Structures are given as structure tokens and as C-alpha cells.
Amino acid sequence: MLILKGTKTVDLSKDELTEIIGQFDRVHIDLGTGDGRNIYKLAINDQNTFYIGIDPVKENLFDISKKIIKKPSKGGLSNVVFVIAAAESLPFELKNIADSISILFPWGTLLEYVIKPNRDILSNVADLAKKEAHFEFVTTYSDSYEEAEIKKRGLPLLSKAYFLSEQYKAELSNSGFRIDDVKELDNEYVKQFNSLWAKRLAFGRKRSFFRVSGHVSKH
Amino acid sequence: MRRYEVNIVLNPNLDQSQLALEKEIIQRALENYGARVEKVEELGLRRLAYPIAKDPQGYFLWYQVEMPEDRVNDLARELRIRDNVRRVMVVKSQEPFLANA
């Protein structure tokens, strides 16, 4: 397992991890974390949860990685770690560990895995979580102008109606996610989200956003 | 050695004795540091421009000495130790720069 220390990458064992998380009541995993800001803001407001951010592209996390290692008085934190990985090869050490997990605005291969969905990969995503952990996914094309993309990776158009369908629900069920809720959100709402892209998308043109949430049932 | 000018302002409320005692320690101190007393003046009491140690007056002592510069700083540390001593200014003697003449 790879974690980020400043701008340098270092190895982290399961035993070390267990010792770290032993000091916390909860573990939250943000998958495809991007720039790290969800985890940073969330972390500054909840010192009782341990935050893990996973992204395959390490340079993106540098600003926040450098920040968290500063002294506490200058913004340093002791409840955040960044994991370097892709959905297709998640560290075994993170199996069955998370009390809650989010994927916000995925793109490329990760987006394809959430929306088709790819059963094996999402199953592996569910594997990071303990039985009945909470999850939320927030996605938005809304389509048309962004396509291009529909022509490329195929993809959903994708209405709340699509996320409500028996087929998507059943596929999710096969992967271990029980849809509890589906919401359509507007630009104004998304500004709550504190993240690269949530901000960029939000202040940009009108778009439909969808938030799908629920619990991990596979276990 | 270098020629200096010691200034000392002490409490204006000392009695004939108390005063002469402080001067004792001074003269005593001077030798202890090499102060070769070239001369002295004693304007004594004077109405200060502003109060010093709440007291609006002061007693003055002026000594022009000659001594090892390497100790002039100590000489004054010593001179300031006294409680009745409320000012001590040592100055390198200087040719009197005249003016309007």
C-alpha cells in the first residue's frame, strides 16, 4: 500500500494502519479523491473520523499533502492519509475497513464503473467497507454538450428515472450496494460540496446533478 | 588611558553625613577601576527639567578622570549600584567646540 508524505511517496502496512485507526471511532473513505479537498475540509470539521483519500495520480494531491504535514497551528492535520491506487487494484490492507465511503464526480474509467456498472470493480469497492457502511455517489453529465463522451464510453443519459430503474438497482444489488435514496440537485445545492469540479461545475452553466446514496449489503 | 568626564546625579535629600558616605564609595570605586581624579566640580542641587525618581531636584557631582577605557563600562556598572545614585553619565572629554566667536 502506497501513501503520500509531503511530495514523497512511502509504503504503509496493515499493522501500522490498524494502529493509526485504533485512535478513531470512524473511518471514511473518499474514492477517486482528486485534489484532496473533500477530505481536507471534512477532516478539519470532524476530528472523530479518520479520512482516507484514494487517487491514482499523486501530483494532484501535493498541495493538500504538504499542508497536512505542517504544524497544527498552520493547518496541519493528524487524521488524513492519501492512498495511491486505482479501482482495479485497491490495496488489500483497506479491505472491510470503512464506516462510510463516497465517490464524487468520477470521470473516465471510474465513471464507467459506477454508471454501467462494472460489477467486479464495484464489488471490490464494496470490499473496502464493513457490512452496512454508508455510501454516496454524485454524478452529472448532464449530457449533450459533453458528448463526445456518450459516443465514446457509450454511457447513460442519465435521468433520476434511469437511477431508479429495476435493472440498475439489481446490478447494484449484485455488487453490494443497496440504493436507499436518489436525489436530483441543482447548481445552487452543489456549492455545498467543497471540491474541485463541484465548484467548477456549480458556478458554470446549469446542469442536472444526481446524488445516489445507501448502504453496503454484500456482507 | 583616555580622559573622561563622570557625571553623577544622586538624591537631593541626603544629610551632611549620608551624602559624604555616597561620595566615599564613589572615590573608593574610582580608584578600584583606575580612575585618576584630574579634578572636580559640585554644582550640588539643581531643579531638574522633569522629575527623577519622583524627586523634582537632584544633587550633582562632576569628575574629570583618566583611566583604562577597558573598564569604563564597569566603573559605571559599579557607580549605578548605589540606591542614592539616580544617574551616571561617563563621557569622553572633548575639545570645547566654540561657536558665534
Binding site: - | 531638574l48 527639567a49 566654540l98 561657536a99 558665534n100
Partner: protein, 73 residues
């Protein structure tokens, strides 16, 4: 205008270096402990520069003021 009288002219031959002549030094002070400008001290760049040190030395010793209150207003 500042053409009342140069403090220098209105006075004798003094030792600008003497820091105890409260009598004369006091002459170069404003209606406050402030040191007068050459415009009024009639001294020169060099003379005036020596005065300052003297007037300051005299202040520490307590002979000359640092600042006085203004009357009238």
C-alpha cells in the same frame, strides 16, 4: 517668515559641546522641549548637528526637558 531673531546672534561665544550650560542650551529649545530648526537657531549644518547631541545629553542628565506643554490654544 521666521524672521524674529536668530538664537545664535542673540547670544555670546559658547561651547556647543558643553552639555551642562542649561543657561545657554535652553535657548535653542522651542516653547516645548523640541530642538529648534536651523531656520531659528541660526546655526550651521555642522554646528546644529553638534547641538543636538549636547541638548540630548543634557536631557538625560535631567537638566533639559524632553517635551513641554503648550499654553494658550
Amino acid at each position: 517668515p521666521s524672521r524674529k531673531a536668530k538664537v545664535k546672534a542673540t547670544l555670546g561665544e559658547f561651547d556647543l559641546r558643553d552639555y551642562r550650560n542649561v543657561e545657554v542650551l535652553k535657548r535653542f529649545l522651542s516653547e516645548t522641549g523640541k530642538i529648534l530648526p536651523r531656520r531659528r537657531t541660526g546655526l550651521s549644518a555642522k554646528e546644529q548637528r553638534i547641538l543636538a547631541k549636547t541638548i540630548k545629553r543634557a536631557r538625560i542628565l535631567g537638566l533639559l526637558p524632553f517635551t513641554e506643554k503648550l499654553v494658550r490654544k
